[PDB]
Design a protein around this motif. Structure first.
Motif, short mmCIF file in Angstrom:
data_model
loop_
_atom_site.label_atom_id
_atom_site.label_comp_id
_atom_site.label_asym_id
_atom_site.label_seq_id
_atom_site.Cartn_x
_atom_site.Cartn_y
_atom_site.Cartn_z
N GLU B 14 6.03 29.25 24.83
CA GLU B 14 5.83 29.86 26.14
C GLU B 14 4.45 29.49 26.64
O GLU B 14 3.45 29.87 26.02
N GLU B 15 4.38 28.73 27.73
CA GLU B 15 3.08 28.17 28.14
C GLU B 15 2.08 29.22 28.63
O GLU B 15 0.87 29.02 28.49
N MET B 16 2.54 30.34 29.23
CA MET B 16 1.60 31.39 29.60
C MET B 16 0.98 32.05 28.37
O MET B 16 -0.23 32.36 28.35
N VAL B 19 -1.72 29.38 27.09
CA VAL B 19 -2.93 29.11 27.87
C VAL B 19 -3.80 30.34 28.06
O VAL B 19 -5.03 30.23 28.07
N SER B 46 8.24 25.72 27.41
CA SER B 46 9.56 26.29 27.69
C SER B 46 9.94 26.17 29.15
O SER B 46 11.13 26.07 29.46
N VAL B 49 6.02 23.01 31.62
CA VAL B 49 4.61 22.63 31.66
C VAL B 49 4.32 21.79 30.41
O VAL B 49 4.74 22.13 29.28
#
Lengths: 188, 188
Positions: B14-16, B19, B46, B49
């Motif tokens: 999960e990119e959030m 990051v 996912s 990104v």
């Protein structure tokens, strides 16, 4: 029938303010293009996260128009957006066709540089207020998300979820935004 | 004297959730390595990104030890973490030396796969509870962030700021975490 978003990604952008709206918009079924200001090469963001864009801005511009143009913040990212003639042209075209323009944190200072939406109520990061208000061309707001016609603004990394959900509500409606929100485990 | 964090980045993460902790930890002056599970090549997250890691996990493992090992979520990312023998070895070494292990959303299910921290109180994403609780080896919590000894867990994309600030508080103290929090414009 799918909505389309352009996210403009410059060196120095705030990577949380870039990735949260992209991810949330894709959860809502919006087709998002992350376009690199300088080309298709990877972009080094403000806290050294390196993100690969989907397209260069020159190529993405040809696949318009977009239902929303999104400007992330980050001080140096916003300065790069403010100096770019290609950005000026995209924003003037979006304003002329009455499409949504969305900008967060330092990002709204690029609206001033390109003379977009004068007369609107806007918010920014607290540290960017004086820059945004040079000349008195906007009215300032301290709301976490502000929307005045086609200009949607928000304040900082910590308002990024609220900003992205406002974009979803503007394009796809309140019910889709509520459906997307629930699995995120947001506090309020 | 600078603290050091390892963030393990797998396809499908999960990119959030990746990051936000990286950015917030770097704001706190922590030296963060984003290590790719499969090598140094860009990782497709996912929601598509694409993030470039700082190092492969094989190389980063040699530059240990780390004050915290961070496992993002994303269902397919966590499944990749769960199947990896290199991850097993890093986590067993971290648990043996009494270093912090931090995992969010689906990420804690990799602790179960590798038999880490049995007997601890943990939380997960609501949709991952049944998987985490197979066998009864942990006690479940619905707190947004949970910390039981050296195991720190959290629930989902929307708890990512709270999770990252808890890591900062654990490593650098409450005053640094409060200083880093203020410019983010968080609600609570």
């Amino acid at each position: 029938a799918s909505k389309r978003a352009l996210v403009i990604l410059a060196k120095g952008a705030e990577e949380m303010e870039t990735v949260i709206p992209v991810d949330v918009m894709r959860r809502a079924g919006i087709k998002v293009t992350v376009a690199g200001l300088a080309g298709k090469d990877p972009v080094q963001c403000s806290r050294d996260v390196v993100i690969c864009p989907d397209a260069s801005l020159e190529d993405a511009k040809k696949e318009g128009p977009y239902d929303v143009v999104v400007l992330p913040g980050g001080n140096l990212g916003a300065q790069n957006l403010s100096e770019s003639a290609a950005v000026k042209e995209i924003l003037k075209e979006q304003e002329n066709r009455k499409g949504l323009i969305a900008a967060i944190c330092a990002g709204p200072t690029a609206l001033l540089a390109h003379e977009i939406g004068f007369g609107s109520k806007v918010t920014t990061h607290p540290l960017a207020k004086d820059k945004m208000m040079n000349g008195g061309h906007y009215t300032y707001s301290e709301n976490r998300v502000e929307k005045d016609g086609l200009i949607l603004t928000s304040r900082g990394p910590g308002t990024s979820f609220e900003f992205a959900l406002a974009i979803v509500e503007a394009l796809n409606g309140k019910e889709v935004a509520a459906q997307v929100k629930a699995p995120l485990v947001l506090k309020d």
